[PDB]
């Protein structure tokens, strides 16, 4: 089997992407944030504290003839941005772009933190990291991809995120029309549960490529590109007036600037992030200070190849017995 679904930016900045997902019988369609940095499929639901729902579409398990309470199971998750959610668990039928999994753990939120409430466009998350990170207790649950893998034509999914435009998540096949040149594959460590890999270096604008190993994670659920402070300083030093602002929480730059591109290495190959992809717009409405899309990871503990980087590429998440990542230009 295969599946193919369009993923759409939630706003004019590409802060996140939502993909429609059918849950239950009859189908209830929710728009979920596909997140290769986590491993829980959780939804706003009829069980979510009413004051914490503000415009999201909810899953109502009592209206699904295929929903079954996973008795005793609870979940609770905290994300790198400080947001969180928790609740109980049903199993139900879940379909993405025509690919159907029966018995998928659907984690029903009883509580969500304010950032989720405040984002009316995201009805939940669909985790695509390794199932070892799934938070369901006492019986850890598998991701949608893990459950689907055996049925897929090939044990892969691909992320093709758009810049200010829709893109595609495919399951079970590699669309050879969706990228240019060849796909370069690189090793993955699953030791932390992430799609963790080592970039071979970087370049700023037309500058020379610096060969240096940068370990990080391919994370569709993180907006920006988070890299070591040395690398980020070298990038922003090429932008007149750019500075790190403790009050804003990162590098800002004059909105009048034209940003240089940023290149990252995948083996001997190179992925170029156009400068425009690094512009996240005014820090507050009407400001002439703009927020940068490349930020330091120094306070995180891990480097994160988030959407800023991934949307410059066609990305293969290869879930073969030894997982690997593939990147192609597009």
mmCIF file of C-alpha atoms in Angstrom:
data_model
loop_
_atom_site.group_PDB
_atom_site.id
_atom_site.type_symbol
_atom_site.label_atom_id
_atom_site.label_comp_id
_atom_site.label_asym_id
_atom_site.label_seq_id
_atom_site.Cartn_x
_atom_site.Cartn_y
_atom_site.Cartn_z
ATOM 1 C CA UNK A 1 0.000 0.000 0.000
ATOM 2 C CA UNK A 2 0.825 3.692 -0.216
ATOM 3 C CA UNK A 3 -0.583 6.998 0.948
ATOM 4 C CA UNK A 4 -0.171 10.568 -0.253
ATOM 5 C CA UNK A 5 -1.474 13.690 1.481
ATOM 6 C CA UNK A 6 -0.997 17.385 0.940
ATOM 7 C CA UNK A 7 0.468 19.387 3.811
ATOM 8 C CA UNK A 8 -0.347 23.088 4.050
ATOM 9 C CA UNK A 9 1.320 25.944 5.973
ATOM 10 C CA UNK A 10 -0.830 27.208 8.837
ATOM 11 C CA UNK A 11 0.094 30.858 8.251
ATOM 12 C CA UNK A 12 2.046 33.191 5.981
ATOM 13 C CA UNK A 13 5.333 32.417 7.791
ATOM 14 C CA UNK A 14 5.235 28.608 7.478
ATOM 15 C CA UNK A 15 5.199 28.381 11.280
ATOM 16 C CA UNK A 16 3.930 24.805 10.946
ATOM 17 C CA UNK A 17 2.164 22.567 8.430
ATOM 18 C CA UNK A 18 -1.143 20.724 8.762
ATOM 19 C CA UNK A 19 -2.167 17.538 6.989
ATOM 20 C CA UNK A 20 -5.728 16.165 6.955
ATOM 21 C CA UNK A 21 -6.145 12.837 8.731
ATOM 22 C CA UNK A 22 -9.265 10.673 8.834
ATOM 23 C CA UNK A 23 -10.012 9.134 12.238
ATOM 24 C CA UNK A 24 -12.848 6.765 13.082
ATOM 25 C CA UNK A 25 -15.978 5.436 11.400
ATOM 26 C CA UNK A 26 -17.560 7.424 9.876
ATOM 27 C CA UNK A 27 -14.429 9.442 9.239
ATOM 28 C CA UNK A 28 -13.718 12.490 11.370
ATOM 29 C CA UNK A 29 -11.166 14.632 9.539
ATOM 30 C CA UNK A 30 -8.711 16.526 11.727
ATOM 31 C CA UNK A 31 -5.792 18.631 10.559
ATOM 32 C CA UNK A 32 -2.694 17.324 12.302
ATOM 33 C CA UNK A 33 0.864 18.588 12.600
ATOM 34 C CA UNK A 34 3.056 15.752 11.328
ATOM 35 C CA UNK A 35 6.056 15.781 13.659
ATOM 36 C CA UNK A 36 9.158 13.684 12.923
ATOM 37 C CA UNK A 37 10.490 14.861 16.308
ATOM 38 C CA UNK A 38 7.905 13.075 18.464
ATOM 39 C CA UNK A 39 6.024 9.808 18.549
ATOM 40 C CA UNK A 40 2.492 10.427 19.857
ATOM 41 C CA UNK A 41 -0.618 10.823 17.709
ATOM 42 C CA UNK A 42 -2.805 13.039 19.886
ATOM 43 C CA UNK A 43 -5.916 15.054 19.129
ATOM 44 C CA UNK A 44 -8.197 17.681 20.518
ATOM 45 C CA UNK A 45 -11.281 15.751 21.515
ATOM 46 C CA UNK A 46 -14.694 15.746 23.141
ATOM 47 C CA UNK A 47 -12.716 15.080 26.355
ATOM 48 C CA UNK A 48 -10.553 18.209 26.138
ATOM 49 C CA UNK A 49 -11.237 20.759 28.887
ATOM 50 C CA UNK A 50 -13.733 23.070 27.215
ATOM 51 C CA UNK A 51 -11.904 26.285 28.164
ATOM 52 C CA UNK A 52 -8.804 24.937 26.391
ATOM 53 C CA UNK A 53 -10.562 24.465 23.026
ATOM 54 C CA UNK A 54 -10.732 27.591 20.845
ATOM 55 C CA UNK A 55 -11.675 26.768 17.262
ATOM 56 C CA UNK A 56 -10.015 23.380 16.797
ATOM 57 C CA UNK A 57 -11.858 20.469 15.264
ATOM 58 C CA UNK A 58 -12.304 17.725 17.845
ATOM 59 C CA UNK A 59 -12.370 13.951 17.694
ATOM 60 C CA UNK A 60 -15.435 12.481 19.396
ATOM 61 C CA UNK A 61 -14.735 8.782 20.026
ATOM 62 C CA UNK A 62 -18.334 8.101 21.076
ATOM 63 C CA UNK A 63 -19.405 8.886 17.492
ATOM 64 C CA UNK A 64 -16.951 6.358 15.997
ATOM 65 C CA UNK A 65 -18.153 2.783 15.718
ATOM 66 C CA UNK A 66 -14.541 1.562 15.547
ATOM 67 C CA UNK A 67 -13.209 3.462 18.577
ATOM 68 C CA UNK A 68 -12.293 1.423 21.643
ATOM 69 C CA UNK A 69 -10.972 2.751 24.925
ATOM 70 C CA UNK A 70 -7.471 1.459 25.567
ATOM 71 C CA UNK A 71 -8.259 0.633 29.160
ATOM 72 C CA UNK A 72 -5.907 2.107 31.734
ATOM 73 C CA UNK A 73 -3.718 3.899 29.214
ATOM 74 C CA UNK A 74 -2.706 7.513 29.742
ATOM 75 C CA UNK A 75 -0.267 9.819 28.022
ATOM 76 C CA UNK A 76 1.520 13.049 28.830
ATOM 77 C CA UNK A 77 4.010 14.901 26.661
ATOM 78 C CA UNK A 78 6.162 18.023 26.874
ATOM 79 C CA UNK A 79 7.732 19.539 23.787
ATOM 80 C CA UNK A 80 10.959 21.453 23.286
ATOM 81 C CA UNK A 81 9.055 24.749 23.145
ATOM 82 C CA UNK A 82 7.590 24.241 26.621
ATOM 83 C CA UNK A 83 4.119 23.251 25.412
ATOM 84 C CA UNK A 84 2.403 20.120 26.678
ATOM 85 C CA UNK A 85 -0.718 17.971 26.573
ATOM 86 C CA UNK A 86 -2.065 14.831 28.227
ATOM 87 C CA UNK A 87 -5.061 12.534 28.352
ATOM 88 C CA UNK A 88 -6.302 9.001 27.746
ATOM 89 C CA UNK A 89 -6.149 6.676 24.745
ATOM 90 C CA UNK A 90 -8.464 5.046 22.238
ATOM 91 C CA UNK A 91 -7.655 2.740 19.382
ATOM 92 C CA UNK A 92 -9.374 3.517 16.106
ATOM 93 C CA UNK A 93 -8.955 3.451 12.350
ATOM 94 C CA UNK A 94 -6.696 6.206 11.033
ATOM 95 C CA UNK A 95 -6.151 7.011 7.363
ATOM 96 C CA UNK A 96 -3.655 9.421 5.792
ATOM 97 C CA UNK A 97 -3.915 10.145 2.104
ATOM 98 C CA UNK A 98 -5.592 6.812 1.379
ATOM 99 C CA UNK A 99 -3.372 4.671 3.627
ATOM 100 C CA UNK A 100 -5.344 3.042 6.450
ATOM 101 C CA UNK A 101 -4.145 1.669 9.792
ATOM 102 C CA UNK A 102 -6.600 -0.180 11.991
ATOM 103 C CA UNK A 103 -6.047 -0.262 15.739
ATOM 104 C CA UNK A 104 -3.967 2.925 15.810
ATOM 105 C CA UNK A 105 -3.507 4.491 19.223
ATOM 106 C CA UNK A 106 -5.311 7.835 19.109
ATOM 107 C CA UNK A 107 -4.370 9.822 22.204
ATOM 108 C CA UNK A 108 -7.292 11.963 23.319
ATOM 109 C CA UNK A 109 -6.318 15.195 25.028
ATOM 110 C CA UNK A 110 -7.931 15.993 28.341
ATOM 111 C CA UNK A 111 -5.566 18.942 28.838
ATOM 112 C CA UNK A 112 -3.490 21.056 26.474
ATOM 113 C CA UNK A 113 -1.218 23.983 27.212
ATOM 114 C CA UNK A 114 -1.992 27.530 26.148
ATOM 115 C CA UNK A 115 0.030 27.504 22.934
ATOM 116 C CA UNK A 116 -2.106 24.667 21.593
ATOM 117 C CA UNK A 117 -5.360 26.351 22.612
ATOM 118 C CA UNK A 118 -4.187 29.573 20.989
ATOM 119 C CA UNK A 119 -3.515 27.897 17.638
ATOM 120 C CA UNK A 120 -6.934 27.186 16.158
ATOM 121 C CA UNK A 121 -5.437 25.660 13.000
ATOM 122 C CA UNK A 122 -3.772 22.597 14.597
ATOM 123 C CA UNK A 123 -6.140 19.859 15.773
ATOM 124 C CA UNK A 124 -3.355 17.641 17.155
ATOM 125 C CA UNK A 125 -0.021 16.064 16.298
ATOM 126 C CA UNK A 126 0.921 12.913 14.390
ATOM 127 C CA UNK A 127 4.312 11.730 15.579
ATOM 128 C CA UNK A 128 6.751 10.181 13.119
ATOM 129 C CA UNK A 129 9.870 9.718 15.265
ATOM 130 C CA UNK A 130 10.677 6.268 16.613
ATOM 131 C CA UNK A 131 8.085 4.526 18.742
ATOM 132 C CA UNK A 132 10.508 4.281 21.666
ATOM 133 C CA UNK A 133 9.614 7.926 22.409
ATOM 134 C CA UNK A 134 5.866 7.283 22.614
ATOM 135 C CA UNK A 135 4.556 8.444 25.987
ATOM 136 C CA UNK A 136 1.599 6.074 26.477
ATOM 137 C CA UNK A 137 1.713 4.302 29.837
ATOM 138 C CA UNK A 138 1.740 1.542 30.962
ATOM 139 C CA UNK A 139 1.879 0.037 27.459
ATOM 140 C CA UNK A 140 3.863 2.097 24.972
ATOM 141 C CA UNK A 141 2.124 2.498 21.612
ATOM 142 C CA UNK A 142 3.391 2.490 18.039
ATOM 143 C CA UNK A 143 3.392 5.398 15.624
ATOM 144 C CA UNK A 144 1.204 5.492 12.535
ATOM 145 C CA UNK A 145 4.264 4.810 10.379
ATOM 146 C CA UNK A 146 5.375 1.893 12.536
ATOM 147 C CA UNK A 147 1.916 0.343 12.323
ATOM 148 C CA UNK A 148 1.698 0.884 8.563
ATOM 149 C CA UNK A 149 5.256 -0.116 7.684
ATOM 150 C CA UNK A 150 4.731 -3.817 7.015
ATOM 151 C CA UNK A 151 1.891 -3.068 4.582
ATOM 152 C CA UNK A 152 3.717 -0.344 2.681
ATOM 153 C CA UNK A 153 5.228 -1.052 -0.718
ATOM 154 C CA UNK A 154 8.522 0.254 0.691
ATOM 155 C CA UNK A 155 9.139 1.037 4.391
ATOM 156 C CA UNK A 156 9.576 4.776 3.889
ATOM 157 C CA UNK A 157 7.833 8.084 4.144
ATOM 158 C CA UNK A 158 8.869 11.349 2.521
ATOM 159 C CA UNK A 159 8.478 14.975 3.497
ATOM 160 C CA UNK A 160 8.253 17.587 0.749
ATOM 161 C CA UNK A 161 7.430 20.807 2.566
ATOM 162 C CA UNK A 162 6.660 23.928 0.586
ATOM 163 C CA UNK A 163 7.999 27.435 1.035
ATOM 164 C CA UNK A 164 4.906 29.609 1.420
ATOM 165 C CA UNK A 165 3.037 26.871 -0.449
ATOM 166 C CA UNK A 166 1.549 23.405 0.069
ATOM 167 C CA UNK A 167 3.688 20.295 -0.082
ATOM 168 C CA UNK A 168 3.301 16.548 0.323
ATOM 169 C CA UNK A 169 3.789 13.673 2.738
ATOM 170 C CA UNK A 170 4.025 10.319 0.959
ATOM 171 C CA UNK A 171 4.012 6.907 2.619
ATOM 172 C CA UNK A 172 5.408 3.774 1.049
ATOM 173 C CA UNK A 173 6.978 5.153 -2.122
ATOM 174 C CA UNK A 174 9.457 7.711 -3.409
ATOM 175 C CA UNK A 175 8.007 10.083 -6.025
ATOM 176 C CA UNK A 176 10.913 10.398 -8.445
ATOM 177 C CA UNK A 177 9.227 13.417 -10.073
ATOM 178 C CA UNK A 178 9.340 15.419 -6.834
ATOM 179 C CA UNK A 179 13.084 16.161 -6.703
ATOM 180 C CA UNK A 180 16.017 17.039 -8.925
ATOM 181 C CA UNK A 181 19.274 15.164 -9.214
ATOM 182 C CA UNK A 182 19.834 12.212 -6.913
ATOM 183 C CA UNK A 183 18.952 11.465 -3.303
ATOM 184 C CA UNK A 184 21.929 11.317 -0.956
ATOM 185 C CA UNK A 185 21.414 8.934 1.945
ATOM 186 C CA UNK A 186 23.120 9.347 5.299
ATOM 187 C CA UNK A 187 23.282 7.281 8.472
ATOM 188 C CA UNK A 188 20.774 7.648 11.305
ATOM 189 C CA UNK A 189 21.211 6.979 15.000
ATOM 190 C CA UNK A 190 18.002 5.925 16.739
ATOM 191 C CA UNK A 191 19.629 5.990 20.190
ATOM 192 C CA UNK A 192 17.649 9.072 21.276
ATOM 193 C CA UNK A 193 14.481 8.062 19.407
ATOM 194 C CA UNK A 194 14.951 10.753 16.736
ATOM 195 C CA UNK A 195 15.873 10.804 13.064
ATOM 196 C CA UNK A 196 19.359 11.838 14.164
ATOM 197 C CA UNK A 197 22.087 12.283 11.568
ATOM 198 C CA UNK A 198 25.380 14.133 11.025
ATOM 199 C CA UNK A 199 25.645 16.944 8.514
ATOM 200 C CA UNK A 200 29.058 17.301 6.906
ATOM 201 C CA UNK A 201 29.250 21.094 7.183
ATOM 202 C CA UNK A 202 27.906 24.410 6.009
ATOM 203 C CA UNK A 203 28.393 27.527 3.940
ATOM 204 C CA UNK A 204 27.032 31.048 4.300
ATOM 205 C CA UNK A 205 25.920 32.694 1.075
ATOM 206 C CA UNK A 206 28.546 32.368 -1.632
ATOM 207 C CA UNK A 207 31.216 31.622 0.969
ATOM 208 C CA UNK A 208 33.450 28.602 1.092
ATOM 209 C CA UNK A 209 32.079 25.390 2.533
ATOM 210 C CA UNK A 210 33.296 24.565 6.043
ATOM 211 C CA UNK A 211 33.716 20.832 6.570
ATOM 212 C CA UNK A 212 32.621 20.026 10.110
ATOM 213 C CA UNK A 213 30.366 17.378 11.610
ATOM 214 C CA UNK A 214 27.034 18.694 12.911
ATOM 215 C CA UNK A 215 24.896 16.089 14.672
ATOM 216 C CA UNK A 216 21.221 16.955 14.671
ATOM 217 C CA UNK A 217 17.677 15.759 14.121
ATOM 218 C CA UNK A 218 15.368 16.034 11.125
ATOM 219 C CA UNK A 219 12.307 17.515 12.817
ATOM 220 C CA UNK A 220 9.279 18.539 10.783
ATOM 221 C CA UNK A 221 7.597 19.702 13.995
ATOM 222 C CA UNK A 222 10.140 22.463 14.667
ATOM 223 C CA UNK A 223 9.804 25.667 12.642
ATOM 224 C CA UNK A 224 13.384 26.915 12.576
ATOM 225 C CA UNK A 225 16.938 25.687 12.046
ATOM 226 C CA UNK A 226 18.844 25.412 15.345
ATOM 227 C CA UNK A 227 22.617 25.032 15.025
ATOM 228 C CA UNK A 228 25.722 25.543 17.146
ATOM 229 C CA UNK A 229 26.419 29.092 18.249
ATOM 230 C CA UNK A 230 29.616 29.258 16.158
ATOM 231 C CA UNK A 231 27.717 28.441 12.963
ATOM 232 C CA UNK A 232 24.841 30.779 13.731
ATOM 233 C CA UNK A 233 27.206 33.653 14.551
ATOM 234 C CA UNK A 234 29.020 33.111 11.256
ATOM 235 C CA UNK A 235 25.696 33.309 9.402
ATOM 236 C CA UNK A 236 24.343 36.454 11.062
ATOM 237 C CA UNK A 237 27.689 38.238 10.825
ATOM 238 C CA UNK A 238 26.943 38.478 7.093
ATOM 239 C CA UNK A 239 23.759 40.503 7.710
ATOM 240 C CA UNK A 240 24.273 44.198 8.463
ATOM 241 C CA UNK A 241 22.614 45.121 11.736
ATOM 242 C CA UNK A 242 21.808 41.578 12.805
ATOM 243 C CA UNK A 243 22.203 40.865 16.493
ATOM 244 C CA UNK A 244 21.241 38.373 19.154
ATOM 245 C CA UNK A 245 18.542 39.881 21.375
ATOM 246 C CA UNK A 246 18.049 38.343 24.806
ATOM 247 C CA UNK A 247 14.778 40.253 25.170
ATOM 248 C CA UNK A 248 13.352 38.886 21.927
ATOM 249 C CA UNK A 249 14.874 35.429 22.384
ATOM 250 C CA UNK A 250 17.285 35.086 19.483
ATOM 251 C CA UNK A 251 18.833 36.682 16.448
ATOM 252 C CA UNK A 252 16.938 39.548 14.870
ATOM 253 C CA UNK A 253 17.819 41.536 11.787
ATOM 254 C CA UNK A 254 16.631 44.660 9.970
ATOM 255 C CA UNK A 255 13.546 43.838 7.955
ATOM 256 C CA UNK A 256 15.119 45.879 5.134
ATOM 257 C CA UNK A 257 17.929 43.319 4.746
ATOM 258 C CA UNK A 258 18.361 40.805 1.960
ATOM 259 C CA UNK A 259 19.438 37.591 3.637
ATOM 260 C CA UNK A 260 22.164 35.294 2.325
ATOM 261 C CA UNK A 261 21.495 31.658 1.650
ATOM 262 C CA UNK A 262 22.670 28.905 3.991
ATOM 263 C CA UNK A 263 24.042 25.607 2.696
ATOM 264 C CA UNK A 264 24.269 22.390 4.698
ATOM 265 C CA UNK A 265 26.124 19.225 3.774
ATOM 266 C CA UNK A 266 24.618 15.771 3.366
ATOM 267 C CA UNK A 267 27.609 13.555 2.731
ATOM 268 C CA UNK A 268 29.252 15.022 -0.345
ATOM 269 C CA UNK A 269 25.985 16.683 -1.406
ATOM 270 C CA UNK A 270 24.769 20.161 -0.541
ATOM 271 C CA UNK A 271 21.303 21.527 0.237
ATOM 272 C CA UNK A 272 20.878 25.274 -0.265
ATOM 273 C CA UNK A 273 18.361 27.166 1.884
ATOM 274 C CA UNK A 274 17.507 30.412 0.040
ATOM 275 C CA UNK A 275 17.879 33.552 2.115
ATOM 276 C CA UNK A 276 14.157 34.294 1.935
ATOM 277 C CA UNK A 277 13.425 31.055 3.810
ATOM 278 C CA UNK A 278 15.317 32.507 6.805
ATOM 279 C CA UNK A 279 13.017 35.560 7.152
ATOM 280 C CA UNK A 280 10.366 35.082 9.854
ATOM 281 C CA UNK A 281 9.070 38.619 9.654
ATOM 282 C CA UNK A 282 8.543 41.380 12.184
ATOM 283 C CA UNK A 283 9.073 40.446 15.834
ATOM 284 C CA UNK A 284 5.782 42.213 16.566
ATOM 285 C CA UNK A 285 3.229 43.700 14.235
ATOM 286 C CA UNK A 286 4.636 46.749 12.479
ATOM 287 C CA UNK A 287 8.176 46.390 13.779
ATOM 288 C CA UNK A 288 11.145 46.889 11.479
ATOM 289 C CA UNK A 289 13.070 44.239 13.433
ATOM 290 C CA UNK A 290 12.632 40.806 11.896
ATOM 291 C CA UNK A 291 13.117 37.397 13.458
ATOM 292 C CA UNK A 292 15.763 35.073 12.054
ATOM 293 C CA UNK A 293 15.083 31.550 10.910
ATOM 294 C CA UNK A 294 18.510 30.257 11.947
ATOM 295 C CA UNK A 295 19.005 30.286 15.713
ATOM 296 C CA UNK A 296 21.444 28.913 18.238
ATOM 297 C CA UNK A 297 20.878 25.446 19.687
ATOM 298 C CA UNK A 298 23.165 26.215 22.621
ATOM 299 C CA UNK A 299 20.257 26.227 25.083
ATOM 300 C CA UNK A 300 18.543 23.127 23.664
ATOM 301 C CA UNK A 301 21.085 20.319 23.952
ATOM 302 C CA UNK A 302 20.615 19.158 20.354
ATOM 303 C CA UNK A 303 20.834 20.666 16.883
ATOM 304 C CA UNK A 304 17.513 20.702 15.032
ATOM 305 C CA UNK A 305 17.044 20.645 11.261
ATOM 306 C CA UNK A 306 13.527 22.008 11.394
ATOM 307 C CA UNK A 307 11.231 23.207 8.647
ATOM 308 C CA UNK A 308 13.550 26.024 7.507
ATOM 309 C CA UNK A 309 16.074 23.384 6.463
ATOM 310 C CA UNK A 310 13.760 20.546 5.500
ATOM 311 C CA UNK A 311 11.573 22.587 3.162
ATOM 312 C CA UNK A 312 14.651 23.251 1.003
ATOM 313 C CA UNK A 313 14.834 19.513 0.286
ATOM 314 C CA UNK A 314 12.936 16.398 -0.598
ATOM 315 C CA UNK A 315 13.516 14.271 2.493
ATOM 316 C CA UNK A 316 13.279 10.481 2.699
ATOM 317 C CA UNK A 317 12.682 8.925 6.105
ATOM 318 C CA UNK A 318 13.826 5.364 5.423
ATOM 319 C CA UNK A 319 12.424 2.983 8.040
ATOM 320 C CA UNK A 320 14.239 -0.099 6.824
ATOM 321 C CA UNK A 321 15.739 -2.413 9.438
ATOM 322 C CA UNK A 322 18.685 -0.021 9.569
ATOM 323 C CA UNK A 323 17.022 3.390 9.167
ATOM 324 C CA UNK A 324 18.617 6.100 7.045
ATOM 325 C CA UNK A 325 17.737 9.609 5.870
ATOM 326 C CA UNK A 326 17.844 10.800 2.270
ATOM 327 C CA UNK A 327 18.015 14.377 1.008
ATOM 328 C CA UNK A 328 17.605 15.679 -2.525
ATOM 329 C CA UNK A 329 17.366 19.154 -3.941
ATOM 330 C CA UNK A 330 14.075 20.075 -5.592
#
